[PDB]
């Protein structure tokens with residue numbers, strides 16, 4: 001029993017974190033095989049700024065060992081520093097681009113040293129509600145499937161509302177953001193509906209049923225309600241994905257939608273669900289199944 | 298900016314997790330140097346659990362009855378001893394991945410990271426607090442026994458908790474790494490229950506200071522309170538008493554934000570009376586009590 005915001009074990013990623021210094025800027029790098037990946041803002045016309053740099057300008061430190069940079073190239077908003085030594089701790093890995101609503105673990109780092117790990121979600125507005133200070137750039141987001149680390153995020157900046165923006169590991173930004181000091185803002189955010197439903201199923205599995213009702217709804221009627229409360233539309237794919245949780249608890253997906261509609265129109269009336277007075281949207285259907293079954297890595 | 302429930306990076310602990318099997322029971326062990334630490338109830342059957350005589354059950358076992366697996370390698374048990382509710386299995390190989398470590402016993406209100414494990418394999422990491430009633434609100438299934446709680450301030454791992462059992466309300470009970478239980482619990486299947494729980498007042502105040510540091514002041518008021526008037530009100534909402542130690546501990550956060558501890562206590566009193574009126578504090582509609590004054594200073598900007 002119990003339901004916590006749980007991150008993946010971070011050890012496979014900890015063994016990849018390095019410190020990257022160029023001039024007065026120090027940030028984090030990800031060392032995989034013989035390449036260190038980091039935000040290109042560590043060095044704007046980035047091609048013009050990069051051509052003026054030599055390999056020895058990039059100081060890379062892995063623990064108490066200085067790695068030697070033997071090459072450098074830019075891919076979108078990520079800088080790839082070729083080093084002479086392959087990381088002996090390189091895990092089995094892939095670079096994957098995630099979709100809004102998907103969750104991942106963040107290993108927050110400062111000076112190439114990991115300080116904490118937390119779980120978060122890519123918001124529908126492409127920002128992440130992270131916890132980062134100056135020096136955290138280059139910190140990464142990931143998931144683990146069996147023994148393979150799927151790197152999905154690299155931290156680049158903080159927006160004026162305190163939320164965060166970054167790229168995939170191929171340097172493509174999530175969201176309409178750019179890596180430069182200019183007027184940028186997070187767009188209006190929405191709630192991840194499929195994730196709220198997954199969390200309601202987790203609450204039922206853990207013994208909370210007060211919000212259940214005898215009613216059902218249609219996808220069309222539910223989506224009219226979701227639009228009114230700034231909730232993302234629910235698709236037939238989302239309904240299909242919630243199939244296993246619907247079969248386990250005996251509550252059809254549109255039956256849980258009628259519970260959610262009632263919660264949106266009436267509130268919680270002083271009650272809580274899994275220790276929360278707000279509807280939680282940062283657990284996917286897969287996260288719920290994984291935590292309620294104890295999958296290991 | 299931002300404020301998350303943050304766990305310590307788990308790698309140093311992942312390299313210590315092993316699987317311990319005795320008869321039909323399999324659970325997790327912590328391998329440090331040449332010793333594997335695990336709950337002593339690994340020697341029990343489900344029947345034995347009502348009134349187990351651990352000394353009598355242990356004397357009947359030999360070293361080869363304990364199967365210890367570290368990854369795909371079987372370790373050899375060369376000795377065994379019991380210390381309180383923990384079993385210490387001496388092995389013939391020291392863990393080459395043993396980090397710098399200490400065993401620390403924590404007090405209620407302290408936080409720690411839990412590396413939840415099944416069959417000696419880590420499945421996830423989350424942040425917990427030792428509740429005032431000595432239980433933890435964890436997330437554990439059958440097979441999670443032997444999973445550990447820890448803190449990693451600097452490069453040293455301080456092991457503070459080892460998971461032993463789930464109580465009927467879904468909360469969890471365990472020991473320090475010397476095998477002493479937190480609270481009045483026993484590693485027996487007798488009728489046991491968590492006592493009435495209370496809110497960790499010093500942690501709620503720390504979290505209100507975190508909200509002020511992050512730019513939120515809506516909840517502040519023009520009032521102050523004596524410590525005794527604060528405690529008389531707070532006890533009516535099942536909040537733990539605030540002591541002069543707690544007031545002293547909140548000194549640095551008070552100096553940084555310019556809000557006196559007793560002035561923040563007055564704001565807490567008003568929040569308990571009024572509720573949040575549709576507002577949130579650091580993305581939460583409830584008053585959060587699982588961040589210590591030390592956690593706030595560590596995570597927040599100076």
Ligand SMILES: O=C1N(c2cncc3ccc(F)cc23)CC[C@]12COc1ccc(Cl)cc12
Nearest residue numbers: 041132133134136156157158179180181298
């Ligand atoms: O947002 C930024 N940074 C921060 C990142 N994460 C949390 C931060 C928290 C506070 C802070 F002051 C800065 C933070 C540091 C660099 C910087 C400042 O200006 C930039 C412009 C463009 C780009 Cl790509 C990056 C940045």
Ligand SMILES: O=C1N(c2cncc3ccc(F)cc23)CC[C@]12COc1ccc(Cl)cc12
Nearest residue numbers: 001338437438439441461462463484485486
């Ligand atoms: O609570 C217990 N266990 C569980 C632990 N953590 C989450 C569990 C979740 C579910 C579950 F069914 C068991 C869990 C497994 C062993 C067991 C069953 O009875 C006991 C009595 C005394 C002691 Cl010391 C231990 C136990």
Ligand SMILES: [Cl-]
Nearest residue numbers: 402403404407
């Ligand atoms: Cl303590």
